[PDB]
Write a protein that binds this ligand. Structure first.
Ligand SMILES: O=P(O)(O)OC[C@H]1O[C@H](OP(=O)(O)OP(=O)(O)O)[C@H](O)[C@@H]1O
Ligand SMILES: O=P(O)(O)OC[C@H]1O[C@H](OP(=O)(O)OP(=O)(O)O)[C@H](O)[C@@H]1O
Ligand SMILES: [Mg+2]
Ligand SMILES: [Mg+2]
Lengths: 346, 346
């Protein structure tokens, strides 16, 4: 195959043949692709409308080039809590906060992330400011996970071959199909997760990729455009279980959640967002907390769905019970401190 | 305006705002665009179907950075004979053949061109293979048009700022909206022409750009896929006249043209394309001659179209009759030779 062959086809508004997206991404990962070819491919693939197979081959190749974690160090039931980003809105780090709470409820967590692309502080940014280390390689992410209950995979450190593509996509400035990869390329390959998507027309495609692996994942998009489960309004959820997707709308009001204004969830620089995490874990009641509990519940229901013998509602109310208890007992706050303390000790 | 604004809008399948296409082009020409941005723009402008205004803006910006010809050196009734190519044939043998016939019939021709991408011989290549100096500055092109009756503007010499876009578009290696520009960025700004386009949908767009200029133009797509008037079957013509456009069907059988086969008309190697020209200008009667004569008449008919008193069928017979004569008298063969001598006498 070739670039004009592949680019020609996409610009003809045609789905690619099996293996074509993989060859293209492999060319990219292996540094054999000129910056203009990367850009054309990325834009062309977005405007055509990508398929699950296509994006699955993109994520597949990427993973196959990624640093893996050591064998028998990632639990069978580990969850991820990560979004695509591209909110447009500049919220406090909801995914990061819920991750800590989830791990504090004793659900193993291997989080993928990096810095903000558009926002003032990313997950990795906010974690850095807290004094939790985001540099850790495969072996120490494995250690951290077993020793603290949570581990953090920093995307650049696990995905060096993405460097070629990453610079190019920054220059473009528009989001593309590539903005989907982060959540689909966690190097630990955890089989569950809560997965945020800022682009409502692409979210089904992510769900499609997760269903191919037979993951238990809720792909989420707030109807306010949030790549999290919102408290402002309702959220659309593509539930991924048993290798099939199904669409839902989710209403916090049915679990007694006060509706909220978007700007109550608004965020700032790293220090500020790190202050917000200390606040919430510390027990500050209000909008931000509600948001964190909600999403933390979400991930826990995805965990629960690893088992086929599971109903939606009883699992959500268990989830909300546990996220809330994880904060209120101080266990969440403990865990963060335990985790910082882990990093300062090789 | 902005790159992210313009690229995002395109990726939403939205037509641009008045001025944006121009701003994008203007950044490219000025050197203010990343190759990643050039690539995203060219791909997206294509997949979202481009409009006449958008392409006019791109053409206009390009023309406003170009070296013009000296004042009062291009006659008001000058014509261009040219195709988009990318027919995948090629047509270069036909366009340069008709161009010379036309000039030889006493219609000033100023052609715009480049060395080929897809085919072995292209407009400039074939010209260069016949001994013609294709790379002359504005003054010498005017002197050529004055003395020889034809001039060729070499797109690299006349559009220095376009260098960036060309390098980028070579790498993506597939047709984009930028492939319509050549015919619409003649530095000599000639107000008539026969304009071949391999893209049916884009032809109508090119036509509307020429309508905006009040040029008298026949945009032509061979219904056999050719970017010239074919003799293989019927053609589609977009008659541009009085700032308006009429889509037509054209059949050369109504002038006694035998149906040829597509593989008797196809351009080839530059050294081959050259010999074919000597062959046919020397008097080689056949299906190549036929189709040169046809396209040459189209060019002359287009020239006739500058007067609103011009009528269609008589214009075509005067056209056919004059092109035939230019060949048979040897005026055309003789014109090629004076054009070659001209270059050798500077
Ligand atoms: O910067 P953007 O492209 O707008 O993306 C929004 C943020 O989301 C990502 O983190 P992640 O989703 O892992 O965690 P978060 O939701 O807690 O930030 C990333 O780190 C960004 O800072
Ligand atoms: O890009 P390609 O597909 O190789 O096209 C071959 C040639 O056709 C065009 O020139 P010209 O208009 O002189 O020839 P045509 O009008 O017959 O296409 C184009 O500028 C090339 O020189
Ligand atoms: Mg998120
Ligand atoms: Mg977010």
């Amino acid at each position: 195959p070739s670039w004009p062959q592949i680019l020609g086809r996409l610009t003809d508004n045609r789905d690619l043949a099996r293996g074509q997206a993989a060859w293209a991404m492999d060319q990219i990962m292996t540094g054999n692709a000129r910056p203009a070819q990367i850009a054309a491919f990325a834009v062309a693939m977005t405007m055509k409308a990508p398929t699950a197979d296509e994006v699955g081959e993109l994520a597949g190749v990427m993973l196959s080039h990624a640093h893996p974690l050591p064998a028998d160090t990632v639990p069978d039931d580990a969850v991820d809590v990560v979004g695509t980003g591209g909110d447009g809105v500049n919220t406090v780090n909801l995914s990061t906060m819920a991750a800590i709470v989830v791990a504090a409820a004793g659900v193993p967590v291997v989080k993928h992330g990096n810095r903000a692309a558009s926002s003032l502080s990313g997950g990795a940014d906010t974690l850095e400011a807290l004094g939790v280390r985001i540099d850790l390689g495969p072996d120490l992410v494995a250690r951290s996970l077993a020793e603290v209950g949570i581990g953090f995979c920093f995307a650049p450190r696990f995905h060096p071959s993405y460097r070629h593509a990453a610079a190019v996509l920054r220059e473009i400035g528009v989001p593309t199909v590539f903005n989907l990869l982060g959540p689909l390329t966690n190097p630990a390959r955890p089989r569950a997760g809560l997965i945020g998507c800022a682009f409502a027309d692409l979210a089904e495609v992510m769900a499609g990729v997760f269903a191919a692996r037979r993951s238990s994942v809720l792909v989420v998009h707030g109807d306010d455009g949030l790549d999290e489960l919102t408290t402002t309004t309702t959220s659309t959820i593509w539930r991924v279980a048993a290798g099939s997707v199904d669409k839902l709308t989710f209403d916090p009001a049915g679990f007694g959640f006060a509706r909220a204004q978007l700007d109550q969830l608004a965020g700032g620089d790293a220090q500020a967002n790190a202050a917000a995490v200390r606040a919430v874990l510390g027990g500050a009641r209000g909008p931000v907390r509600d948001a964190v509990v909600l999403n933390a519940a979400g991930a826990i229901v995805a965990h629960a769905g690893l088992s086929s013998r599971a109903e939606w509602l009883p699992a959500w109310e268990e989830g909300l019970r546990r996220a809330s208890a994880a904060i209120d007992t101080g266990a969440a706050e403990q865990l963060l401190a335990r985790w910082v303390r882990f990093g300062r000790q090789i």
